[PDB]
Design a protein around this ligand. Structure first.
Ligand code: NAD
Ligand code: NAD
Ligand code: 7PC
Ligand code: 7PC
Lengths: 282, 277, 277, 282
């Protein structure tokens, strides 16, 4: 049982929580990490900074930790500026195709893929005031990255393997302040999940679903006090008033990835203490 | 110990059984509620070892008890003659919803997993348009209201962080000609009620409740549904009652503490398809 | 001439009236069905000119007739004593669904627009969780099944390319604490039944059927709903009964020949909002 | 009552049918037209070729017919190659900002906007096999064009104005063969419709909805016998067995655009003889 988690920059995200729970079930974990934060993540790991967090009387497995940039499909896609940037030029094989081939050489076929990354340069702006170039950015890094991720991993994956991504309810209902086309990319990503589920199903016997998670105070969540407010609101209005942990998403992700969800494919599962069901406060 | 009540089962060919088999994998003690009129039969078949092979998991399914259970009656007060003097019913006792909740609580104490796995419409083979008021409401009473009732009476005998599920079918959201009698209307209400109950039980008892929208099984209309499904579903595999059961097991556990009020499709992905090919 | 039957109206403060006003704009002749127990009152108020100003469109609303109408009874056969000897009912006649369809057909011939605008649950102020079986089913019978019944008996007296609508509320899809008694379950089923009826009536009689999911009006719970709505809805304007009526008029016309089985939200866009701001 | 229809290349589309019905109600119509087909559309108009089709005992109004390219927001966005292409270099003011300013000079404020255009270079490929550049193409011309269209027209539009676009059910359910990210763009567009509806509502008292239309044998529909099959299927399985005309979409569009739908905003209305409601054939 091998899982590649694409998109973990630290310990405060959904990627980490997913990692943790996949370990409880003894699956081997390969982190794919964005180069802007790669050196410093590695450093912290070495300094045993994440050592508290790797606690489960269990200890986390971490098979490998690779540089990974979901905006590049192949090496030909890497622009020269990036190729030479201070933070990339010492690193290698970080395109989507490249990490796919890496992994396969080092470990062969794997059977679990977590897409856990999103990005938009104009997330701060709202839809109307987002540029074409900013919108297409959001969709390229949040939505298309999934598709591409699939294209390349699908054949280093065994039959009956399963894939998941992460989404947010703002695709289905309006959350003012979730901007830059981020809603649009979650909308796109939830649709692609259905279409990919059809293709990967018939053709590769491979499942794909997506988890619509609640608010977590991740690094990326602070890409705009919205989130503190979102957590506040969720903890007062959701059917379940417990605090939403990333491990909560993690245990569901783990389930989706296991053979136990063998007959669930193409779905948007909500893991959010049921907030999505409410129309009216009280 | 962990105890699950499965309300609505008459053989091994259904969901309740698949759900029971899978729960047994986590060593959950199982109590079956059986519709009184087939209860003794079921009890007989059990004795004659008829369910022996279906019961093997290599470990034996631990069936804590098997009780008469009629989802159409809330309390004893509702047992309305004739019924009281009906050939089958009169030899049995304590089969109303509230009565069953008392027995279970008395013999075993509190439980922590509830499964509503029962559907019945007396006119299930006619168009909604040709369904009678009496028929429709029987559908809603047995297949929809029963869920609320079961919750009302069982919440008192459940630990906090308990979990509930029912079974639903996609006919509620999209047209399936053939699923008549108001079974569609029933599931529509069941799914909506699952949301509403999720809010109340969640806030008031920290109890979760979800519904599994399952694909066709077996346990006429079903024979088409299955062929169509295995033809067009994203996933080519045969859908098993344990496929629903393993999902149920998960939903009924703490691993899904943050999921509630949801409709989970376990149908090989049939629901995502628009037109064939 | 074009004739619309509006089943479910007791004053000018509701949807049936707003719908009636707007239909009158297209010179549609209107027949009102009134719940028998308030029928004579309504008839009195009509006589005393109480509805005179509400009736002006500058042209006068043409009310073809006003008949007692009880959505809880399908045929005469169902009028079950007491009811037959109830203070209000016994002085009236032909108010069952089938009976009304016969009168209309007899006096005016075929119609071509039907409006189901009636909702009633006897326990509308309690939680779903505290709602009784009797209460729930009354809800489903009056607010949901009535729709099917009305279709069953009226299709015979309708021209082809006829059109039908009912009114629904978003509580069916998402939790609105306060909308209890199974009104939510009712609307859930009404919306699902609208799809199913759309298939049958569409294929079998080329008749269309849709439902309007309206925002709060007036006609307690509503007072909050309205303030919240006018605060948070995408559209700041006050929502009028004629806002629903103008949409209804459209849906009931040939201009919408290619729309059927749909739930149309007329609620200033409230439904698209997740969290406030 | 002025309406700008963005995206009509001939008489066989939804744009034309919408035009026709808006005329029945005496509203003035400005066609925005893609330059690759502009000269030839004009020619046909002049040769009175469309004269049969402009029949309603009514005759169509056509206030103006402008060149229009929804892939350009402003003149600065026009690449030099395009700027010089055989088919563009004789034409002017065809960016989104430009046609917005044109129209306003010539006629002032308008109050009706029809988005009726879509495009994807790799529509023939299916999701998995679509490139980043092809996906982003679909989203840029089918989804973002709407947003941009709004940004620029919103303030040459009076309060209480209304906007509509066109979508297809493949966003919500899987239609194999509707590829190139076209499903993804309909998914995105239906989401943006909700978010735009919130912003335009509160801020400009302006409504936006989208129509999910059935199959019509438009020029663009043949961008892949899929459609003949789609029309075949729809006419045998839809609740309504009538043939679906573009004027059917047109009369609904007209309604959405009128004050009659004054309280409907942010919605996806299905105009498809109810096919979307079916799960199972028979
Ligand atoms: N935090 C929330 O409230 C919330 C809610 C719902 C959904 N989500 C989703 O969860 C997922 C994970 O986000 P998170 O909230 O855990 O924050 P996060 O910052 O931990 O996760 C995003 C990570 O992806 C990496 N990344 C960004 N762009 C990349 C690229 N081009 N390629 C590779 N790596 C890249 C970043 O380094 C970052 O660490 C996202 O898809 C997000 O949309 C988050
Ligand atoms: N035909 C169908 O079965 C169907 C079904 C559902 C939805 N739709 C939608 O209806 C809308 C109209 O398409 P149609 O089916 O009438 O075909 P159509 O070809 O008549 O409409 C598309 C028109 O937009 C123009 N166009 C394309 N790219 C453009 C750009 N960059 N800027 C400006 N103009 C451009 C083209 O010249 C074309 O004539 C589309 O949004 C489509 O997605 C069509
Ligand atoms: N540059 C941007 C960026 C924007 C959003 C992101 O993901 C999310 C980050 C936060 C939330 C969120 C926000 C509020 C409440 C609940 N969840 C949802 C998300 O999808 C990420 Cl990971 C990055
Ligand atoms: N290059 C491409 C391109 C692709 C799809 C398009 O629009 C549609 C064209 C056809 C259908 C369609 C296809 C089959 C059945 C019903 N509708 C749906 C659409 O959204 C258009 Cl206008 C252009």
């Amino acid at each position: 049982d091998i899982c590649f988690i694409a998109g973990i920059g630290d310990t405060n995200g959904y990627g980490w929580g997913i990692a943790k729970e996949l370990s409880k079930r003894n699956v081997k974990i390969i982190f794919g990490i964005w180069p802007p934060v790669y050196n410093i993540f590695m450093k912290n790991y070495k300094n045993g900074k994440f050592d508290n967090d790797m606690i489960i009387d269990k200890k986390m497995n971490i098979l490998d930790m690779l540089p990974f940039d979901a905006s590049f499909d192949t090496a030909n896609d890497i622009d020269e500026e990036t190729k030479n940037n201070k933070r990339y030029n010492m690193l290698q094989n970080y395109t989507i195709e490249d990490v796919a081939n890496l992994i396969h050489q080092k470990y062969g076929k794997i059977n679990m893929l977590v897409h856990s990354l999103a990005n938009a340069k104009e997330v701060q702006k709202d839809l109307l005031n987002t540029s074409r170039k900013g919108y297409l950015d959001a969709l390229s890094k949040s939505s298309y990255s999934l598709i591409s991720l699939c294209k390349y991993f699908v054949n280093i994956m065994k039959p009956q393997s399963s894939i998941i991504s992460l989404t947010y309810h703002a695709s289905q209902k309006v959350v003012p302040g979730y901007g830059g086309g981020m809603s649009s990319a979650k909308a796109a990503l939830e649709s692609d999940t259905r279409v990919l589920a059809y293709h990967l199903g018939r053709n590769y016997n491979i499942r794909i679903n997506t988890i619509s998670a609640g608010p977590l105070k991740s690094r990326a969540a602070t890409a705009i006090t919205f989130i503190d407010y979102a957590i506040e609101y969720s903890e007062k209005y959701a059917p379940l008033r417990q605090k939403l942990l990333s491990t909560d998403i993690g245990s569901v992700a783990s389930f989706l990835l296991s053979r136990e969800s063998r007959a669930i494919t193409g779905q948007t599962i909500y893991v959010d203490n049921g907030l999505n069901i409410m129309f009216l406060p009280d």
